[PDB]
Design a protein around this ligand. Structure first.
Ligand SMILES: Cc1cn([C@H]2C=C[C@@H](COP(=O)(O)OP(=O)(O)OP(=O)(O)O)O2)c(=O)[nH]c1=O
Ligand SMILES: [Mg+2]
Ligand SMILES: [Mg+2]
Lengths: 555, 412
DNA sequence: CAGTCCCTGTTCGGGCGCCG
DNA sequence: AACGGCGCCCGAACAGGGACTG
């Protein structure tokens, strides 16, 4: 006979055709034994845990880990087998709140619900599926087995149920206090208002007594009344916010697992520290698949690491969001496909920073990667502020106009303005739209053997110029690119090039300035040196122009 | 007082589990106000996390309208109930709708809220309203009545719709009325004044039983096609003929009678691209014959009602967009071109969005289906902006392609 | 015409950071 | 040694289209 809590239960079922968990316990140290017997006894008197008998043919191993920055212990239940047989839940946590999205509030209070999961009841018909034994002695007393009447920690349905239950309890209080902002993330509550300090504490106590009606306690242990407030891993001040101090490890010998933690902290730090790069550091995590393997730092990864530690020396901070002012996002090119940005409303008062260094595609250019960065910043801004910032981009209006009007795919950038901060983004060469009068016409082609991997590449011209180059360990695609490279090498500043390769033409027409292919990069270098290049395509094996003549030479 | 029509998913398929995407501030505020009124009226109810299903939701404004409309992306749920709104309770498509002089589209989705939904099926209509900066967890609802945007809503309401439209069709036997999704397509051969007058009579027929005041007008008789055309020059260069032979060779996949023998003979040798080549007597003969074949229709091209429609769009530049609708490759049921749409010369995504909506509307009128689109755009670019410019209550299927223009096929 | 190859694309799961 | 959320950078597995060969 246990009292039913005021919180409405969530009807939880299991996947049909499956039973409950039947897993043997795990032998643990005697320190863990003396830390769990005192918990199950306290939860039994408080009604949070009921005792069962032989009528429950289920079992699940448990353990514990130390609470962060405390002497208390966190009781965990390894429900990994129960989660496989429990129904799926739809998660209601859609993201992480960011301090740059918080508005200015005169009074701020950060609460913390004590025993979050242990205060929300479990489904009545589901409590029988949560069985676990607690041995008093490691090899003497069999230990009476208990069950769960609340939400166990370790179950895949506990977070979704608590977050949904906490919302229904706060809904009546928010309806009675509309001007009060309550950021509800798990059990931690951020309460802000423009009321005076005295009147603010009054509504805080009203909220504490409101939650107490459903058995939710807000102890004065983790009750924050004075700034700076520690919320979501940040330091919240009345007029600014900053990330809690980030400590980077400084080992003499670097392994693989150490760099993974290093890049992760720099990714977390780049949200407010401008100019953080992790290209050369993450480049070391390629190929090697041994976490306990020492990796020597390259000269590029060492200079990148030294520049990141210097940025973290001077303290930085972000500001809060003012809806009366516009959102500005300015991007800088860091080179080698690296982009950094800052989002602000007043000059040099950054709300947050960030970086975009993703390399998608074997061939691309700065204009494509800038477009991708704009899209990343836009979606990120809609999550945090619900609107798109005005962009300040290091690309000329004429440059962008030339790119998007001529590209074959739909592409667009929202309202933006040019900012003259080198290095500027530009197109490094422009293919002509009509053939060039007086320029030599090169008919290029390339063939390769599928078996021997041998091939040829060459050209013929209208002036009688001709070349055929034998190639070893190649493909048909590589010989077509090689044929174009030969034409660019052996031609003047202005040249017309005719090819039948849809593969090669598609790469070059997209005006790439960088490539994972060394051959394409050499082709790009030649295209930049030229003054006029006209690429033309013809269907192969049709007796068209000199394409039939060069086809005989290479095949 | 109405028995709920039993609805079941297609055997072997679970409900939709699609994540909600981020919404702008004005869209979230619009949905919070709309869903509050719907919950007060019992149309929707709040649910918990024990419902594992979810469908995205956002808001739109129709053309020349300042009112927010709630739009649920039921595309996943619709193809998981395909044997319901196509096999069991299907709506026949009138072939005469496309022949009418004027067709008006009326939003009648509000009438679906008067019919309850099957209790065993309501769990599949779940959606989640997000919050700015994740201040609060997602607010989940589910529909208690027939939801707008679900293809099962007009199928269940079809029996109710027939009795309401029964007197009006008797009064005007020449008017064709087609129902697709939340819309009602009304076509007639009356004059503009007579047509709009008869449209208002139909509105009053529905009133005696919030977007009914709007009327998007169409003119399918004014719809044109964009055939494959060849250039006509006074002088021809080597490059001009190489482009012509390349275009005619690709067109041979559609018209098997096209020949390039006499035209390829003009390119004998290794000539400069800009060198002028006079057309021989046989070359003029072959080029004149190919121009007539492009006017002749394609053999064995007809609509199969059991096959899906496919739409390809090409960005031609300067506000020009070409498109082809087909079921089998090189068997185009319709080709066309759009020019000077909204966003021309400034926004590709708005134009592409406008083009998709136009093509889908044409497909609903002509065949009663929406095509699956092959969009010439990167996925991340489209998924970032398309909801900002969407003005329709339905959403077609689409995929993303990247085909560089090796030869201008549909627009020289 | 099938069956491959070459090349490029997306998807997904895990590594790490971070929150509770 | 547990669960859920979001982000990044990584590699393996898979998909799809042009082109060559039997
Ligand atoms: C940190 C953490 C948390 N949780 C769940 C449980 C309760 C909520 C909040 O956890 P908590 O605030 O740190 O502990 P809590 O149970 O609230 O007890 P208090 O310290 O607040 O009194 O999230 C979890 O399941 N695993 C974890 O590692
Ligand atoms: Mg707590
Ligand atoms: Mg070739």
């Amino acid at each position: 006979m246990v009292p039913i809590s005021p919180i409405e239960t969530v009807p939880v079922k299991l996947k049909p055709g499956m039973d409950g968990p039947k897993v043997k316990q795990w032998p643990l140290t005697e320190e863990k034994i003396k830390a769990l017997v005192e918990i199950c006894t306290e939860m039994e008197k408080e009604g949070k845990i009921s005792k069962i008998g032989p009528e429950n043919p289920y079992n699940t191993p448990v353990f514990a880990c130390k609470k962060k920055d405390s002497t208390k212990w966190r009781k965990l239940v390894d429900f990994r087998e129960l989660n496989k047989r429990t129904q799926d839940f739809w998660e209601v946590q859609l993201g992480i709140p960011h301090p740059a999205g918080l508005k200015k509030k005169k009074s701020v209070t950060v609460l913390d619900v004590g025993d979050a999961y242990f205060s929300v009841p479990l489904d009545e018909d589901f409590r029988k599926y949560t069985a676990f034994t607690i041995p008093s002695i490691n090899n003497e007393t069999p230990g009476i087995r208990y069950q769960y009447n609340v939400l166990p920690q370790g179950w895949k349905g506990s977070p979704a149920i608590f977050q949904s239950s906490m919302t229904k309890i706060l809904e009546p209080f928010k309806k009675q206090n509309p001007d009060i902002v309550i950021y509800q993330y798990m059990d931690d509550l951020y309460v802000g208002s423009d009321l005076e300090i005295g009147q603010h504490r009054t509504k805080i106590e009203e909220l504490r007594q409101h939650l107490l009606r459903w058995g939710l306690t807000t102890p004065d242990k983790k009750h924050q009344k004075e700034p700076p407030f520690l919320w979501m891993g940040y330091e919240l001040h009345p007029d600014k916010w900053t990330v809690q101090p980030i400590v980077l490890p400084e080992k003499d010998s670097w392994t693989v697992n150490d760099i993974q933690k290093l890049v992760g902290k720099l990714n977390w730090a780049s949200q407010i520290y401008p100019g953080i790069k992790v290209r050369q550091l993450s480049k070391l995590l390629r190929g090697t698949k041994a976490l306990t393997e020492v990796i020597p730092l390259t000269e590029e990864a060492e200079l990148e690491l030294a520049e990141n530690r210097e940025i973290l020396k001077e303290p930085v901070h972000g500001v809060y969001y003012d809806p009366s002012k516009d959102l500005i996002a300015e991007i800088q090119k860091q080179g080698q496909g690296q982009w950094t940005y800052q989002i602000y409303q007043e000059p040099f008062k950054n709300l947050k920073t960030g970086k975009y260094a993703r390399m998608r595609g074997a061939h691309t250019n700065d204009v494509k990667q800038l477009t991708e960065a704009v899209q990343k910043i836009t979606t990120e801004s809609i999550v945090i502020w619900g609107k798109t910032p005005k962009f300040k981009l290091p690309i000329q209006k004429e440059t962008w106009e030339t790119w998007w009007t001529e590209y074959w795919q739909a592409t667009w950038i929202p309202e933006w303005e040019f900012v003259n901060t080198p290095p500027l983004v530009k197109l490094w060469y422009q293919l002509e739209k009509e053939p060039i009068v007086g320029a030599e016409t090169f008919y290029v082609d390339g063939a390769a053997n599928r078996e021997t991997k041998l091939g040829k590449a060459g050209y013929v011209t209208n002036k009688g110029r001709q070349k055929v180059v034998p190639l070893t360990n190649t493909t048909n695609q590589k010989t077509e690119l090689q044929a174009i490279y030969l034409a660019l090498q052996d031609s003047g500043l202005e040249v017309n090039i005719v090819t039948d390769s849809q593969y090669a033409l598609g790469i070059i027409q997209a005006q790439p300035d960088k490539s994972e292919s060394e051959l394409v990069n050499q082709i790009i270098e030649q295209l930049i040196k030229k003054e006029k290049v006209y690429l033309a395509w013809v269907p192969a094996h049709k007796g068209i122009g000199g394409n039939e003549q060069v086809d005989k030479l290479v095949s | 007082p109405i028995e709920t029509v039993p609805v079941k998913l297609k055997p072997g398929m679970d409900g939709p589990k699609v994540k909600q995407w981020p919404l702008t501030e004005e869209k979230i505020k619009a949905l919070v106000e709309i869903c509050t009124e719907m919950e007060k009226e019992g149309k929707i109810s709040k649910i918990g996390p024990e419902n594992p299903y979810n469908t995205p939701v956002f808001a739109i404004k129709k053309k020349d309208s300042t009112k927010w409309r709630k739009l649920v992306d039921f595309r996943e749920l619709n193809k998981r109930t395909q044997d319901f709104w196509e096999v069991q309770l299907g709506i026949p498509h009138p072939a005469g709708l496309k022949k009418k002089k004027s067709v008006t589209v009326l939003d009648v989705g509000d009438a679906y809220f008067s019919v309850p939904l099957d209790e065993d099926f309501r769990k599949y209509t779940a959606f989640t309203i997000p919050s700015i900066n994740n201040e609060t967890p997602g607010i989940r609802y589910q529909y208690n009545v027939l939801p707008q945007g679900w293809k099962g809503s007009p199928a269940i309401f079809q029996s109710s719709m027939t009795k309401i439209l029964e007197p009006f069709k008797k009064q005007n036997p020449d008017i064709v009325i087609y129902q697709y999704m939340d819309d009602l397509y009304v076509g007639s051969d009356l004059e503009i004044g007579q047509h709009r007058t008869k449209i208002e009579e139909l509105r009053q027929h529905l009133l005696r039983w919030p977007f009914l005041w709007m009327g998007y007008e169409l003119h399918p008789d004014k719809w044109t096609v964009q055939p494959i055309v060849l250039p006509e020059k006074d002088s021809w260069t080597v490059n001009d003929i190489q482009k012509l032979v390349g275009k005619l060779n690709w067109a041979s996949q559609i018209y098997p009678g096209i020949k390039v023998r006499q035209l390829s003979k003009l390119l004998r040798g290794t000539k400069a691209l800009t060198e002028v080549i006079p057309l021989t007597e046989e070359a003029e003969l072959e080029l004149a014959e190919n121009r007539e074949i492009l006017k002749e229709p394609v053999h064995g091209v007809y609509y199969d009602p059991s096959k899906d429609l496919i739409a390809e769009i090409q960005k031609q530049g300067q506000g020009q967009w070409t498109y082809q609708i087909y079921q089998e490759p090189f068997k185009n049921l319709k080709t066309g071109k759009y020019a000077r749409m909204r966003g021309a010369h400034t926004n590709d995504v708005k134009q592409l969005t406008e083009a998709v909506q136009k093509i889908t509307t044409e497909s609903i009128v002509i065949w009663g289906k929406t095509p699956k689109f092959k969009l010439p755009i990167q996925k991340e670019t489209w998924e970032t902006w398309w909801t900002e410019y969407w003005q329709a209550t339905w959403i077609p299927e689409w995929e993303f392609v990247n085909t560089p223009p090796l030869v201008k096929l549909w627009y020289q």
